[PDB]
Amino acid sequence: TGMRGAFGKPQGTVARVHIGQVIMSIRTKLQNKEHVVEALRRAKFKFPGRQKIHISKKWGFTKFNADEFEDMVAEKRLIPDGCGVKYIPNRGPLDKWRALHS
Amino acid sequence: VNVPKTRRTFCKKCGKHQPHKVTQYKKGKDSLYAQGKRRYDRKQSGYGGQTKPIFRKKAKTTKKIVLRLECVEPNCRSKRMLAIKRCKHFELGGDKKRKGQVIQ
């Protein structure tokens, strides 16, 4: 306070960004291409500084890429289950389930 | 702490381990005279002054207890002195604790 042992005490709580972070991801129907960026550009005016906006090259919040994702799902290596899709390698001990029905 | 009254250990005069009886130490008073006390008196003598510096700012709350060992061999009178780490309580040869049966 009078600097005779000055050291602050907790107040507020922030998050640290990194060049290339992803502060907000919106998912919707492809028809809403110009609603997504239109709305999301507002957040550029609430956050400090400049933040490039961007349209993902992925199906959703998945690890995956352009819509060959769904081809892979047809191949059954990707299982639609929950807000994301569960990956499946060809490892594992179900070499009788993959027989009975893959 | 606590220590039993009788324990065997090296009796220097004997030359071997022998049993010893332990009595905890307490200070003396004056030989009858001692030239320290004698000069201190003749220095206090005369008009004025407290010559040798009295000691008032105390800071220690326990004295280094000391055990006095007596031999027991007939005509091995010897008595030898030994120390122990500090302590805020002391007992001697008291009631020993058996465990595994303790009730609050």
Binding site: G20, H54, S56 | -
Partner: protein
């Protein structure tokens, strides 16, 4: 910040690495140390009796005393700008040999054998360790194709 403490900042140093928290494998006990071969000092943690101080964790120096189950070691401690040749005791669980000298001894043996063989053949070969010279002039055969055309990648965004 703190000052004197026999083991400061040895939370990770003496820590029995990242899976081997077991008892001491016995070969470290069973190794034969002699008077005057270069050990090196890496402190363990399980021994609990006789550790070198953390100033000597990693240094390496001659050995000059051999007790029952702990050797003395002469190592160079760095202090203010003088360098001291200090002597210590270390339980043998913290020391180990150091190939630094052993490789030199092997190459000594090959040098002397080569000298003897030069005695036998009359020809003076080059004795050890001429340092690494620059490259020689060699022909690169290109039969198989004409070289690959290599060209920069245009920018793309992967957030």
């Amino acid at each position: 910040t703190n000052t004197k403490g026999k083991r400061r900042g040895t939370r990770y140093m003496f820590s029995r690495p990242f899976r081997k928290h077991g008892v001491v494998p016995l070969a470290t006990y069973m190794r034969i140390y002699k008077k005057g071969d270069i050990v090196d000092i890496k402190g363990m943690g399980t021994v609990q009796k006789g550790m070198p101080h953390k100033c000597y964790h990693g240094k390496t120096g001659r050995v000059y005393n051999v007790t029952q189950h702990a050797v003395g070691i002469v190592v160079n401690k760095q202090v203010k700008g003088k360098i001291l040749a200090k002597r210590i005791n270390v339980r043998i669980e913290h020391i180990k040999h150091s190939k630094s000298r052993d490789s030199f001894l092997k190459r000594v043996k090959e040098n002397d054998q080569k000298k003897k063989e030069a005695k036998e053949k009359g020809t003076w070969v080059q004795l050890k360790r001429q340092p690494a010279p620059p490259r020689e002039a060699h022909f690169v055969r290109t039969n198989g194709k004409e070289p690959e055309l290599l060209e920069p990648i245009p920018y793309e965004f992967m957030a």
